[PDB]
Structure formats: structure tokens, C-alpha cells
Amino acid sequence: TLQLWTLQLPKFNPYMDDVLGSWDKLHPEALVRWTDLPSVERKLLAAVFARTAPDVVNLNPPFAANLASKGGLTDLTALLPPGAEQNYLPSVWEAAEAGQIAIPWYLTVRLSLVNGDLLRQAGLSRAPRRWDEVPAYARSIRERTGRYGLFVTVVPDDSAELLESFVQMGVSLLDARQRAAFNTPAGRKAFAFWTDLYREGLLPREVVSQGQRRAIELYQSGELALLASGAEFLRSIQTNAPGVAAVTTPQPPLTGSDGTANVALMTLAVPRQSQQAGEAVELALFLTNGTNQARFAREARVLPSSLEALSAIRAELEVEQPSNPAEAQIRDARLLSAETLNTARVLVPATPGVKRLQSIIYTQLQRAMLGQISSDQAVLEAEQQWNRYASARWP
């Protein structure tokens, strides 16, 4: 039997129950036992210590790089059928220094869910689309409505949107040698950007202590004018808070002057300890073929990495006839995500130790937002702490 490990998937039990069921009908010799987890490295280490490593593991570019730098992922090129990469988007297939360590699965382009009713209360007609327009926008929301314009968490190991904003703001995080590269005019400007927003009462005070689940809660309460989220969460807004969804419009995500948006890549990898690597590759290919990826794109309102499924999903969206405004809203969001994908890139560099770097930056930025140190003081402390870590790991 094979053990499949997926990341943060309750709402998608029926999808998994059918596709894995189909797999079990096709491959009775390698039945799948599925476990979904949130905190992934601790559980992989325990299974590998017991010499019971899973066969297919769901990863993202940052975590996949930490594992592959240590020789833990199978080079799939040896086992992949010839012309298997032809079935995937080339930009996302090549998004995996240790060879081909992962097969692309699905991906998400997050949009700006804008509360249009809060905008009219603030005397605004639309939400900003670039970060240098965020302060003026946030002030108008804060003073005329009392609500908050946006919510970006600085809890060290929560969402990476803050670190992604650094990249969108032109900040260079690491050089070749893995040394700190953000003590630059861009990095100091980015640190001051977030410090000044918090100190001026423009951000919710709990951004230093709560993650995107609080942002979700604030938007559904009508207390957040812009929520960085995808199409799938829009349907739960429709059910949980119809008053807010009725005045919600999907909008392009916030970017920097370069325009690039972020895309969250989900992949499937085969640990080197796996004793059924060939069957594991077959399972990863089955989960990511045209039919299964298209079906998951519909049920999850997500974008696939399969060319066949991506074109099929784009085609269904262009000719979909929604029966009510709710379905039309969901169609508008999914279509905007599919259109944004042509300009979106992966922004957190798929390098080892990026979560250590995120934690150091978020911690120092947090000290500056609370007024315990200056912004430049946070930059220096972050730079020196990262170089402490980087000299020990990569001398």
C-alpha cells in the first residue's frame, strides 16, 4: 500500500474519496492510505526515522528546497515517462538544483476581495492595485469609516504575504552564498512602509499576533475593506455572510511597480526512502493528469498545472452561464485568477531556510511596529541574525 500526504485539504474529502477510489480500482496492488496534515517536517522525520516514509508527499517550492538540499527527494527524471513534462505548464514544471524533485499539482492566484460598501462609505470608488497607493487608501478607510483597509499578518510562521510584499517592493532577500541581501534602500523602505502603517493606526493591532484567519473573520464582519483571498473562500463568504458577499467584488491582487502577482504552487514529491518509487510516480501522475486536475479545479475553484485541464477550465469559464448573481460572482473571481496567472510568478525564492528568514524578519519588524526599536534597527538586527544562521549552515 501507498501512503499519500496532503496539506490542509475537510472541505475536499469527497474529491479525494472518489479519485483515490478510482486509483484503488485501477491499482489494487498499491492501495492508497491518505493522511492530511497542516508542521509537515516533524511528521516526515518521525516516519523516516521508523523507515516508513510516505510514498507521495504534498509540498510547496520553499519546503521542497529545504528537503531536496538534503538528498531526501527522489529524482523523478529516471522514473518519469518520456514526454511527461509535455502535459504540464512549462513555467510551473521547471519550478522544481537537485534534479526534478516534484510534479506540479494545483496552484492558486489570490485576488483582492473588496468590500464595495465600505469604499463608498470612505468616499472611494475603487481599491488600489499597487503597494505605493496602499497608505493613502488605508488612511481614507480608517478615518472616514473607522474600519481597516487591509490585514497583513506579521506572525512569523503564518502567511508569507508580508515577505511576498517585500519581494513585490523590489527587495532582494538573499544573495548567492545565502547571505542577507535586504539591508538595502529597498529593504529599509519596505521595513519603514510596514512600521509606519502600524504606528499610524492604519493596520489592525492584532496583525502582530493573529494570522489570516482573523482577516477572514474581519472581512465577514464588514470590518475589513480588502481581503487578499481566492475564489474558493468567496463561496464560503456567500454562505456565511451574504450581506458582505453581495457588496464584494473580486479585484486584481496588490503588486509592486513591476506588476507581478504571486502564485502559490503545490507539488507532489517522492521521498528517497520510498521503496515503491515507481508506483509513487504513477500515483502522482494520476492525481495530476488532465481529468483529475480539471475536476479538482472545478470543485476547489483553483487553477490546475495541466495544460489540458487549464485550457478546459479557461474554456468553461468563458462560456459559463451563471444562474444567479452568486454563481456569477464566483465565475468572475475564477476568471480573474486565470487571467492573472499569465502575469503572476512565484515570489518567495525556492531556497533552503526561507522560513527561518521569514521568522527573523517578521520578529524584528514586529519589534519596530510596537515601537520598541526603529525600522532601521529592525533591519540591522534581522540582517545580523540571519548572517549568524547563514554562516553556520553555509560557511
Residue numbers in the entry: 10 to 18, 20 to 48, 51 to 108, 112 to 410
Article sentences:
We report the functional characterisation of a modified sugar-binding protein, MsBP, from a marine Synechococcus strain, MITS9220. Ligand screening of MsBP shows a specific affinity for zinc (KD ~ 1.3 μM) and a preference for phosphate-modified sugars, such as fructose-1,6-biphosphate, in the presence of zinc (KD ~ 5.8 μM). The presence of the additional C-terminal subdomain places it unambiguously within sub-cluster D-I, associated with a narrow substrate preference for carbohydrates.
Our crystal structures of apo MsBP (no zinc or substrate-bound) and Zn-MsBP (with zinc-bound) show that the presence of zinc induces structural differences, leading to a partially-closed substrate-binding cavity. The structure of MsBP displayed two chains in the a.s.u. No electron density attributable to a ligand was distinguished in either structure, indicating both proteins were crystallised in ligand-free forms. The intervening binding cleft shows a markedly positive charge, suggestive for orienting a negatively charged substrate. Overall, the structures of MsBP and Zn-MsBP overlay with r.m.s.d. 0.87 Å (Cα atoms), with the most striking difference caused by marked and localised tilting of helix 2, attributable to a lower degree of conformational variability in loop 3. As previously discussed, the general nature of the binding cleft of MsBP is positively charged, which is markedly different from structural relatives that display negatively charged binding cavity, appropriate for interaction with simple sugars.
